[PDB]
Short mmCIF file of C-alpha atoms and ligand atoms in Angstrom, two decimals:
data_model
loop_
_atom_site.label_atom_id
_atom_site.label_comp_id
_atom_site.label_asym_id
_atom_site.label_seq_id
_atom_site.Cartn_x
_atom_site.Cartn_y
_atom_site.Cartn_z
CA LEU A 1 -0.04 0.01 0.06
CA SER A 2 1.17 3.41 -1.03
CA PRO A 3 0.78 6.26 2.09
CA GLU A 4 -2.06 7.84 -0.04
CA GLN A 5 -3.74 4.74 -0.88
CA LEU A 6 -3.45 4.20 3.17
CA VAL A 7 -5.07 7.35 3.76
CA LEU A 8 -7.56 6.84 1.27
CA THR A 9 -8.55 3.34 3.41
CA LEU A 10 -8.65 5.42 6.58
CA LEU A 11 -11.08 7.86 4.69
CA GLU A 12 -13.07 4.66 3.75
CA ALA A 13 -13.19 3.61 7.26
CA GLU A 14 -14.65 6.69 8.64
CA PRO A 15 -17.79 5.98 10.78
CA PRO A 16 -20.93 7.76 9.61
CA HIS A 17 -22.63 10.97 11.54
CA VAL A 18 -24.10 9.94 14.81
CA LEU A 19 -27.14 12.20 15.66
CA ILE A 20 -28.91 11.29 19.31
CA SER A 21 -32.27 11.27 18.16
CA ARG A 22 -33.42 12.78 21.63
CA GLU A 23 -28.69 18.14 33.97
CA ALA A 24 -29.67 14.79 33.55
CA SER A 25 -30.55 15.14 30.15
CA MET A 26 -27.44 16.29 28.91
CA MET A 27 -25.33 13.25 30.56
CA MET A 28 -28.22 11.15 29.30
CA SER A 29 -27.17 12.57 25.61
CA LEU A 30 -23.43 11.81 26.16
CA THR A 31 -23.65 8.43 27.54
CA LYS A 32 -26.38 7.32 24.55
CA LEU A 33 -23.88 9.02 22.00
CA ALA A 34 -21.23 7.54 23.23
CA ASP A 35 -22.68 3.74 22.80
CA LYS A 36 -23.64 4.56 19.55
CA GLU A 37 -20.25 6.10 18.39
CA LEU A 38 -18.47 2.97 19.77
CA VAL A 39 -20.40 0.48 17.79
CA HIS A 40 -19.21 2.53 14.87
CA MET A 41 -15.33 2.85 16.17
CA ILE A 42 -15.50 -1.06 16.28
CA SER A 43 -16.41 -1.37 12.63
CA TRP A 44 -13.76 1.80 11.87
CA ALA A 45 -10.94 -0.27 13.58
CA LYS A 46 -11.47 -3.35 11.52
CA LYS A 47 -11.21 -1.16 8.09
CA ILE A 48 -7.75 -0.36 9.23
CA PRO A 49 -5.70 -2.50 6.86
CA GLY A 50 -3.87 -5.42 8.92
CA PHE A 51 -6.13 -4.57 12.00
CA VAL A 52 -8.26 -7.80 12.10
CA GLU A 53 -5.01 -9.66 11.35
CA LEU A 54 -3.90 -8.69 15.11
CA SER A 55 -4.74 -11.27 17.80
CA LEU A 56 -8.37 -10.90 19.00
CA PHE A 57 -6.50 -10.56 22.46
CA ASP A 58 -4.72 -7.57 21.08
CA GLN A 59 -7.82 -6.11 18.91
CA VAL A 60 -9.71 -5.90 22.38
CA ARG A 61 -6.67 -4.39 24.11
CA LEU A 62 -6.16 -1.32 21.65
CA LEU A 63 -9.75 -0.69 21.71
CA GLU A 64 -10.42 -1.11 25.60
CA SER A 65 -7.24 1.13 26.13
CA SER A 66 -8.37 3.90 23.14
CA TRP A 67 -11.53 4.38 22.69
CA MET A 68 -12.25 7.60 25.06
CA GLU A 69 -9.22 9.32 23.22
CA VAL A 70 -10.83 8.05 19.90
CA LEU A 71 -14.06 9.49 21.02
CA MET A 72 -12.30 13.04 21.96
CA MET A 73 -10.31 12.87 18.59
CA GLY A 74 -13.30 12.71 16.72
CA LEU A 75 -14.94 15.33 18.83
CA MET A 76 -11.84 17.87 18.21
CA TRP A 77 -11.86 17.32 14.63
CA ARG A 78 -16.03 17.91 14.39
CA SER A 79 -15.50 21.17 16.21
CA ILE A 80 -12.20 22.60 14.63
CA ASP A 81 -14.36 25.28 12.70
CA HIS A 82 -16.54 25.97 15.58
CA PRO A 83 -14.69 28.04 18.12
CA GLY A 84 -16.55 28.15 21.53
CA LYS A 85 -18.22 25.01 20.57
CA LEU A 86 -18.26 20.95 21.09
CA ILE A 87 -19.81 19.39 18.02
CA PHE A 88 -20.85 16.20 19.84
CA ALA A 89 -23.71 15.55 17.06
CA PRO A 90 -25.76 18.11 14.87
CA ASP A 91 -28.12 17.90 17.49
CA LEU A 92 -25.75 17.78 20.53
CA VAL A 93 -23.79 21.30 20.30
CA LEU A 94 -22.64 22.22 23.55
CA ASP A 95 -20.92 25.14 25.37
CA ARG A 96 -18.88 25.55 28.37
CA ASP A 97 -22.06 27.20 29.90
CA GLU A 98 -24.27 23.81 29.21
CA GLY A 99 -20.97 22.36 30.66
CA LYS A 100 -21.27 24.07 34.05
CA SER A 101 -24.49 22.68 34.88
CA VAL A 102 -22.88 19.04 35.93
CA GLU A 103 -20.29 18.82 38.59
CA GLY A 104 -16.77 18.01 36.99
CA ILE A 105 -18.18 18.76 33.38
CA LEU A 106 -16.68 22.62 33.07
CA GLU A 107 -12.90 21.25 33.62
CA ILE A 108 -13.31 18.33 30.74
CA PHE A 109 -15.08 20.96 28.36
CA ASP A 110 -12.27 23.62 29.20
CA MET A 111 -9.69 21.40 28.12
CA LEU A 112 -11.12 19.36 25.11
CA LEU A 113 -12.01 23.46 24.06
CA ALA A 114 -8.47 24.04 24.52
CA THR A 115 -6.79 21.27 22.55
CA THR A 116 -9.58 21.70 20.00
CA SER A 117 -8.26 25.64 19.64
CA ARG A 118 -4.67 24.09 19.45
CA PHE A 119 -5.48 21.77 16.06
CA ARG A 120 -7.49 25.14 15.08
CA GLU A 121 -4.16 27.28 15.48
CA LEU A 122 -2.06 24.44 13.65
CA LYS A 123 -4.58 24.19 10.95
CA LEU A 124 -5.13 20.65 11.06
CA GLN A 125 -6.20 19.07 7.91
CA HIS A 126 -8.60 16.15 7.31
CA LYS A 127 -5.86 13.85 6.61
CA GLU A 128 -3.69 14.53 9.20
CA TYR A 129 -6.53 13.81 11.43
CA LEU A 130 -7.34 10.47 9.90
CA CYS A 131 -3.85 9.50 10.62
CA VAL A 132 -3.36 10.97 14.06
CA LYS A 133 -6.51 9.16 14.83
CA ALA A 134 -5.80 5.48 13.75
CA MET A 135 -2.33 6.34 15.85
CA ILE A 136 -4.04 6.80 18.68
CA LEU A 137 -5.58 3.01 18.49
CA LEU A 138 -2.71 1.74 17.39
CA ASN A 139 -0.06 3.40 19.85
CA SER A 140 -2.15 2.92 23.04
CA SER A 141 -0.34 1.77 26.28
CA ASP A 142 3.47 -12.46 15.65
CA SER A 143 0.82 -9.77 16.87
CA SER A 144 2.97 -7.59 18.26
CA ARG A 145 5.55 -7.42 15.16
CA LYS A 146 2.08 -6.89 12.86
CA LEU A 147 1.16 -4.24 15.33
CA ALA A 148 4.68 -2.04 15.17
CA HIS A 149 4.46 -2.59 11.33
CA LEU A 150 0.59 -1.40 11.12
CA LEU A 151 1.65 1.78 13.44
CA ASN A 152 4.56 2.36 11.04
CA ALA A 153 2.66 2.38 8.34
CA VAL A 154 0.04 4.82 9.87
CA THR A 155 3.12 6.79 11.09
CA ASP A 156 4.63 7.10 7.01
CA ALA A 157 1.51 7.70 6.06
CA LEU A 158 1.46 11.30 8.23
CA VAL A 159 4.88 12.22 7.28
CA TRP A 160 3.40 11.67 3.60
CA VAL A 161 0.68 13.87 4.56
CA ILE A 162 2.96 16.76 5.66
CA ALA A 163 5.14 16.11 2.58
CA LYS A 164 2.05 17.20 0.53
CA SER A 165 1.60 20.44 2.35
CA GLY A 166 4.84 21.55 0.39
CA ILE A 167 6.40 23.35 3.32
CA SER A 168 10.01 23.29 4.08
CA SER A 169 11.96 19.97 5.42
CA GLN A 170 12.47 22.10 8.57
CA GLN A 171 8.79 22.90 8.92
CA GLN A 172 7.44 19.38 7.97
CA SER A 173 9.12 18.21 11.25
CA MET A 174 8.11 21.00 13.36
CA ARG A 175 4.47 20.05 12.04
CA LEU A 176 4.92 16.45 12.88
CA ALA A 177 6.13 17.17 16.11
CA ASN A 178 3.32 19.83 17.03
CA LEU A 179 0.71 17.25 16.08
CA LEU A 180 2.12 14.43 17.98
CA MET A 181 2.59 16.64 21.07
CA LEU A 182 -0.96 17.53 21.35
CA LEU A 183 -1.62 13.78 21.50
CA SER A 184 -0.53 13.58 25.35
CA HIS A 185 -3.26 16.61 25.42
CA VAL A 186 -6.11 14.37 24.16
CA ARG A 187 -4.94 11.19 26.34
CA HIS A 188 -5.20 14.01 29.08
CA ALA A 189 -8.37 14.85 28.72
CA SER A 190 -9.43 11.06 28.04
CA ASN A 191 -8.30 10.43 31.42
CA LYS A 192 -9.71 13.14 33.37
CA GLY A 193 -13.42 12.03 31.21
CA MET A 194 -12.57 8.15 32.04
CA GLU A 195 -12.36 9.29 35.99
CA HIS A 196 -15.64 11.25 35.45
CA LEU A 197 -17.80 8.41 33.91
CA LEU A 198 -16.58 5.92 36.06
CA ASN A 199 -17.36 7.91 39.27
CA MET A 200 -21.02 8.89 36.88
CA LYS A 201 -21.18 4.82 36.93
CA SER A 202 -20.53 4.08 40.76
CA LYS A 203 -23.20 6.50 41.67
CA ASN A 204 -25.02 4.81 38.73
CA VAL A 205 -26.83 8.60 38.10
CA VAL A 206 -26.05 7.74 34.01
CA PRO A 207 -27.74 4.82 32.70
CA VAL A 208 -25.62 1.26 32.13
CA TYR A 209 -25.71 1.14 28.44
CA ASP A 210 -24.06 -2.46 27.47
CA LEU A 211 -21.19 -1.77 25.03
CA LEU A 212 -20.16 1.64 26.90
CA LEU A 213 -20.67 -0.22 30.48
CA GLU A 214 -18.28 -3.05 29.00
CA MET A 215 -15.68 -0.49 27.56
CA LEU A 216 -15.84 1.40 31.06
CA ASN A 217 -15.34 -1.63 32.80
CA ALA A 218 -12.25 -2.57 30.63
CA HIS A 219 -10.53 0.53 32.91
CA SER B 1 -21.82 -9.46 27.94
CA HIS B 2 -19.13 -9.89 25.10
CA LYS B 3 -20.91 -7.18 22.34
CA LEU B 4 -16.75 -6.33 21.52
CA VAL B 5 -15.73 -9.68 20.72
CA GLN B 6 -19.31 -9.96 18.80
CA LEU B 7 -19.02 -6.99 16.68
CA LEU B 8 -15.07 -7.73 16.21
CA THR B 9 -15.74 -11.15 14.77
CA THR B 10 -19.47 -10.31 12.68
CA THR B 11 -20.20 -7.64 10.22
CA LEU C 1 20.01 30.56 21.23
CA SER C 2 21.40 28.00 18.64
CA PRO C 3 20.19 24.11 18.72
CA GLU C 4 23.68 23.19 19.46
CA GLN C 5 23.79 25.94 22.27
CA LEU C 6 19.90 25.30 23.79
CA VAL C 7 21.40 21.20 23.76
CA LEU C 8 24.89 22.31 25.68
CA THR C 9 22.62 24.35 27.83
CA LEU C 10 20.54 21.06 28.73
CA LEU C 11 23.80 18.94 29.17
CA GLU C 12 25.20 21.04 31.51
CA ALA C 13 22.04 21.63 33.74
CA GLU C 14 21.40 17.96 33.89
CA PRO C 15 20.77 16.82 37.75
CA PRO C 16 23.67 14.94 39.56
CA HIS C 17 22.58 11.57 40.19
CA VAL C 18 21.12 11.20 44.08
CA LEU C 19 22.96 8.58 46.21
CA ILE C 20 20.46 6.19 48.32
CA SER C 21 21.63 3.08 49.97
CA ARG C 22 19.64 -0.18 49.84
CA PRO C 23 18.25 -0.97 52.92
CA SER C 24 20.24 -3.54 54.88
CA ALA C 25 17.82 -5.78 55.51
CA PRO C 26 15.60 -7.22 52.39
CA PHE C 27 12.99 -5.22 51.40
CA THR C 28 9.82 -5.09 53.04
CA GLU C 29 6.49 -2.77 52.17
CA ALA C 30 8.06 -0.02 54.05
CA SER C 31 11.46 -0.05 53.15
CA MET C 32 11.02 -0.33 49.56
CA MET C 33 8.50 2.77 49.75
CA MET C 34 10.46 4.56 52.38
CA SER C 35 13.52 4.09 49.49
CA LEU C 36 11.33 5.24 46.52
CA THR C 37 9.62 8.48 47.95
CA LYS C 38 13.37 9.71 50.00
CA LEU C 39 14.86 9.27 46.20
CA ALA C 40 11.75 11.11 44.83
CA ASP C 41 11.84 13.87 47.54
CA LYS C 42 15.59 14.65 46.86
CA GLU C 43 15.49 14.52 42.90
CA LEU C 44 12.15 17.01 42.92
CA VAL C 45 14.84 19.62 44.83
CA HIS C 46 17.04 18.88 41.85
CA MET C 47 14.43 19.24 38.74
CA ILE C 48 13.39 22.38 40.15
CA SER C 49 16.84 23.73 39.81
CA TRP C 50 17.13 22.08 36.35
CA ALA C 51 14.11 23.50 35.42
CA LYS C 52 15.15 27.02 36.09
CA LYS C 53 18.51 26.48 33.99
CA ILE C 54 15.83 25.57 30.56
CA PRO C 55 16.66 29.01 28.99
CA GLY C 56 13.38 31.10 29.25
CA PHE C 57 11.53 28.45 32.07
CA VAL C 58 12.40 31.31 34.88
CA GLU C 59 10.75 34.00 32.19
CA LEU C 60 7.26 32.38 32.53
CA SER C 61 4.73 33.75 34.83
CA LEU C 62 5.47 31.79 38.31
CA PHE C 63 2.01 30.07 37.99
CA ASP C 64 3.02 28.93 35.04
CA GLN C 65 6.37 27.58 36.43
CA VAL C 66 4.11 25.41 39.33
CA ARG C 67 1.60 24.27 37.08
CA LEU C 68 4.12 22.63 34.63
CA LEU C 69 6.26 21.31 37.16
CA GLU C 70 3.07 19.58 39.44
CA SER C 71 1.61 18.34 35.98
CA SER C 72 5.07 16.95 34.67
CA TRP C 73 7.37 15.99 37.54
CA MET C 74 6.39 12.24 38.11
CA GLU C 75 7.07 12.09 34.03
CA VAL C 76 10.27 13.78 34.21
CA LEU C 77 11.41 11.61 37.14
CA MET C 78 10.53 8.40 35.10
CA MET C 79 12.21 9.68 31.82
CA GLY C 80 15.21 9.76 33.96
CA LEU C 81 15.09 6.40 35.66
CA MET C 82 14.11 4.86 31.75
CA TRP C 83 17.62 7.01 31.18
CA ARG C 84 19.77 5.68 33.86
CA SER C 85 18.53 1.75 33.39
CA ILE C 86 19.04 1.99 29.78
CA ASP C 87 22.55 0.77 29.49
CA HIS C 88 21.40 -2.22 32.28
CA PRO C 89 18.67 -4.50 30.80
CA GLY C 90 16.01 -6.36 33.60
CA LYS C 91 17.06 -3.21 35.74
CA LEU C 92 15.61 0.08 36.97
CA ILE C 93 18.47 1.84 38.21
CA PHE C 94 16.68 4.06 40.65
CA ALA C 95 20.07 5.39 42.17
CA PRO C 96 23.61 4.07 42.21
CA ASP C 97 23.53 1.42 45.05
CA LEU C 98 19.18 1.02 44.46
CA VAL C 99 19.20 -1.00 41.45
CA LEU C 100 15.65 -3.23 41.28
CA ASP C 101 14.36 -5.84 39.48
CA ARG C 102 10.68 -7.62 38.94
CA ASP C 103 11.83 -9.63 41.79
CA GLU C 104 12.16 -6.50 44.41
CA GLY C 105 8.72 -5.42 42.61
CA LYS C 106 7.10 -8.15 45.00
CA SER C 107 7.29 -6.17 48.43
CA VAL C 108 4.95 -3.81 47.55
CA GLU C 109 1.37 -4.66 46.38
CA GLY C 110 0.76 -3.22 42.73
CA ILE C 111 4.47 -1.91 42.39
CA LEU C 112 5.44 -4.72 40.04
CA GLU C 113 3.05 -3.35 37.47
CA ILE C 114 4.65 0.02 37.66
CA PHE C 115 8.24 -1.57 37.27
CA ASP C 116 6.96 -3.84 34.39
CA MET C 117 5.74 -0.45 32.06
CA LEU C 118 8.90 1.43 33.04
CA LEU C 119 10.79 -1.73 32.11
CA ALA C 120 9.18 -1.92 28.92
CA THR C 121 9.04 1.44 27.62
CA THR C 122 12.99 1.34 28.56
CA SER C 123 13.33 -1.38 26.01
CA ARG C 124 11.47 0.81 23.60
CA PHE C 125 13.93 3.70 24.32
CA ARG C 126 16.88 0.70 24.14
CA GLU C 127 15.22 -0.60 20.40
CA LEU C 128 15.26 2.72 19.17
CA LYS C 129 18.80 3.43 20.72
CA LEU C 130 18.05 6.77 21.87
CA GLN C 131 20.99 9.14 21.99
CA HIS C 132 22.27 11.47 25.16
CA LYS C 133 21.42 14.69 23.32
CA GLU C 134 17.95 13.30 22.39
CA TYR C 135 17.08 12.49 25.74
CA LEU C 136 18.52 15.62 26.93
CA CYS C 137 15.36 17.20 24.42
CA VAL C 138 12.56 14.96 25.08
CA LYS C 139 12.92 15.40 28.98
CA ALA C 140 12.41 19.03 28.52
CA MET C 141 9.52 18.44 25.98
CA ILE C 142 8.07 16.34 28.78
CA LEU C 143 8.29 19.51 31.16
CA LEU C 144 7.02 22.13 28.60
CA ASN C 145 4.14 20.00 26.98
CA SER C 146 2.70 18.88 30.52
CA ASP C 147 2.91 37.49 27.92
CA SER C 148 3.51 33.74 29.44
CA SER C 149 1.59 31.43 27.20
CA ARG C 150 3.13 32.73 23.85
CA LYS C 151 7.02 32.45 25.79
CA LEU C 152 5.97 28.50 26.68
CA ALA C 153 4.90 28.13 23.12
CA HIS C 154 8.27 29.77 21.98
CA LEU C 155 10.31 28.02 24.42
CA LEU C 156 8.42 24.27 23.44
CA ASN C 157 9.48 24.89 19.51
CA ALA C 158 12.73 26.10 20.38
CA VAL C 159 13.64 22.78 22.35
CA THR C 160 11.41 20.80 19.25
CA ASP C 161 13.68 22.56 17.21
CA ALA C 162 16.56 21.28 18.92
CA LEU C 163 15.60 18.07 18.79
CA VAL C 164 15.09 18.00 15.23
CA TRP C 165 18.74 19.16 14.92
CA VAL C 166 20.05 16.54 16.92
CA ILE C 167 18.47 13.98 14.72
CA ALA C 168 19.79 15.82 11.41
CA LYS C 169 23.40 15.45 12.78
CA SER C 170 22.80 11.27 12.74
CA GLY C 171 22.90 11.76 8.70
CA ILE C 172 19.89 9.64 8.22
CA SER C 173 17.47 10.66 5.24
CA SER C 174 15.29 13.41 5.47
CA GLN C 175 12.19 10.72 5.70
CA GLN C 176 14.03 8.79 8.10
CA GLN C 177 14.60 11.95 10.32
CA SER C 178 10.96 11.99 10.19
CA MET C 179 10.24 8.63 11.13
CA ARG C 180 12.81 8.77 14.08
CA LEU C 181 10.88 12.03 15.53
CA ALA C 182 7.82 10.37 15.08
CA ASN C 183 8.87 7.24 16.90
CA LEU C 184 10.63 9.22 19.87
CA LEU C 185 7.65 11.43 20.00
CA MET C 186 4.99 8.30 20.36
CA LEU C 187 7.06 7.14 23.27
CA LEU C 188 6.16 10.11 25.45
CA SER C 189 2.09 8.88 25.63
CA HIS C 190 3.97 5.75 26.83
CA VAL C 191 5.96 7.78 29.39
CA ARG C 192 2.77 9.56 30.64
CA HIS C 193 0.66 6.28 31.07
CA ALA C 194 3.28 5.14 33.10
CA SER C 195 3.15 8.09 35.19
CA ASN C 196 -0.64 8.51 35.56
CA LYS C 197 -0.67 4.54 36.98
CA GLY C 198 2.63 5.53 39.34
CA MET C 199 0.69 8.76 40.76
CA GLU C 200 -2.30 6.69 41.17
CA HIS C 201 -0.35 3.95 43.23
CA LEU C 202 1.40 6.75 45.62
CA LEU C 203 -1.86 8.34 46.17
CA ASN C 204 -2.99 5.04 47.18
CA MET C 205 0.30 4.49 49.26
CA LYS C 206 -0.53 7.82 50.88
CA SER C 207 -3.96 6.82 52.01
CA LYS C 208 -2.96 3.70 53.62
CA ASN C 209 -0.03 5.75 55.97
CA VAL C 210 2.62 3.61 54.31
CA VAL C 211 4.48 7.17 52.84
CA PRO C 212 6.62 9.09 55.05
CA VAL C 213 6.47 13.01 55.69
CA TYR C 214 8.60 14.72 53.02
CA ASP C 215 7.01 17.85 52.73
CA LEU C 216 7.90 18.48 48.76
CA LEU C 217 6.97 15.46 47.66
CA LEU C 218 3.56 15.55 49.25
CA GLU C 219 3.15 19.03 47.76
CA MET C 220 3.70 17.76 44.39
CA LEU C 221 1.77 14.46 44.91
CA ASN C 222 -1.76 16.75 46.44
CA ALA C 223 -1.34 18.83 43.18
CA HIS C 224 -2.11 15.52 41.38
CA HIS D 1 4.59 26.54 49.48
CA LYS D 2 7.81 25.05 49.12
CA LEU D 3 7.30 24.52 45.73
CA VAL D 4 7.42 28.61 45.09
CA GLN D 5 10.24 29.08 47.51
CA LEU D 6 12.80 26.49 45.92
CA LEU D 7 11.51 28.39 41.99
CA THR D 8 11.70 32.32 43.54
CA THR D 9 14.37 32.39 46.80
CA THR D 10 16.63 29.57 45.82
N1 I1I E 301 -18.14 15.85 27.16
C1 I1I E 301 -17.91 14.17 27.22
C2 I1I E 301 -18.17 12.69 27.26
C3 I1I E 301 -16.71 12.40 26.61
C4 I1I E 301 -17.21 12.14 25.04
C5 I1I E 301 -16.23 12.46 24.00
C6 I1I E 301 -16.68 12.45 22.52
C7 I1I E 301 -17.80 11.69 22.30
O1 I1I E 301 -18.19 11.72 21.07
C8 I1I E 301 -19.06 11.19 23.32
C9 I1I E 301 -18.12 11.60 24.59
CL1 I1I E 301 -19.21 11.23 25.75
C10 I1I E 301 -18.21 12.35 28.56
C11 I1I E 301 -19.11 11.31 28.92
C12 I1I E 301 -19.28 11.16 30.26
C13 I1I E 301 -18.48 11.72 31.24
O2 I1I E 301 -18.24 11.10 32.68
C14 I1I E 301 -17.29 12.37 31.19
C15 I1I E 301 -17.34 13.07 29.68
N1 I1I E 302 8.74 3.55 40.14
C1 I1I E 302 8.70 4.56 40.98
C2 I1I E 302 8.28 5.39 42.11
C3 I1I E 302 8.43 6.96 41.69
C4 I1I E 302 10.17 7.27 40.81
C5 I1I E 302 10.32 7.12 39.67
C6 I1I E 302 11.76 7.69 39.11
C7 I1I E 302 12.72 8.18 40.15
O1 I1I E 302 13.71 8.50 39.53
C8 I1I E 302 12.17 8.11 41.25
C9 I1I E 302 10.90 7.29 41.71
CL1 I1I E 302 10.42 7.20 43.23
C10 I1I E 302 7.32 5.17 42.65
C11 I1I E 302 7.29 5.57 43.98
C12 I1I E 302 5.83 5.59 44.85
C13 I1I E 302 4.96 4.65 44.23
O2 I1I E 302 4.07 4.70 45.02
C14 I1I E 302 4.94 4.33 43.36
C15 I1I E 302 6.28 4.26 42.12
#
């Protein structure tokens, strides 16, 4: 596979736009969205060339580790052209004000909003997003050799995407560093988010959705 | 509840 | 100012190794925990001094300096540990006389998990043949990536620019330079994971009353 | 307190 045709495979793997068709209301809307998105995330993963050639254990471990980070990366990309807004879905657009209405959510909104603004400032391109979202899954903390090859391939594709911008070799290096540094900011917001959701689950104040419940219990 | 494995193994 | 001058400044700024004696008796929960936290408290003093020597750090808002160090200290400690451990496979070189295997992990409930992560990430750095000058740039990047906001961006770009310069002096192709930079930076999220697990572990040990009164460590821990 | 002391008065 050329880097170009790997990137087109990620373009083809992109899940559909998910709508919620829907205080307690905001939080029910987020958990319901996450449960539907998790169904589409599994189909996405399986369309990444080589992913289904990994051991089932490895497939399961990578999605268990990375699912919240992959959801938040998708949220940041949908929000990028909508300053002050988190485009959870066309029918679930939220600002920090709506966030204030549930304890601990303000912090998470004002973190997702910040990282989104960094991506906005770097002018993150769609093909860059495709590559980093796949890298988040594949880099999450016979099969092990296949995983290293697959991660190497997506990394090679991101380098190619940056090369296509036509900026200097120096500026290609700086941009690659800048993008990959934002990854630890996605993983940070992911950690704060997973803590807040586990806490909401332990208090049973958010509805127990089967796929989301199973993905949260992994952690 | 094994929906992750179910979805990984079917389409 | 130049990338080479920034790398020479970091090299000179490297902390001296903190000396801690192995306990006389075989490790207990209490003796391992006393050993590791005494080391961290002493390294934290040297870390603050190292941070002040990064060009531009002391020009940040005091409140930014504090937030960067409260956010990153355990990752900075772990990156130092992995570097000290890179020439010694199977071993975690916490200090010259504090050389721990998966074995000694047994002495504290949950610590073996942390040692495994540290040993595995150390292996990745070893396979990549991490170089001294690369390590120096990556350790400063961990701190800085954890009007003051514009300065921080500028200071992080200067360090990034130095890491790019260090990889260029290796003389590999432009594509291979990009891949090496990607491979190093993607290891940062793994250092940070080991940091999150280690911090949660340490906070739980503080709850069990196993942790001693080390004022700086306690402060840094309560920042979480 | 100790962090601020080490940053500013050391
Ligand atoms: N905001 C938010 C979400 C994270 C998220 C990101 C992207 C999505 O597409 C869907 C969600 Cl739920 C969240 C849910 C529960 C919780 O306790 C804390 C945060
Ligand atoms: N591993 C480890 C240490 C952290 C550490 C890292 C690097 C260092 O150079 C020095 C230390 Cl103490 C640790 C301490 C307490 C605890 O509950 C869990 C882990």
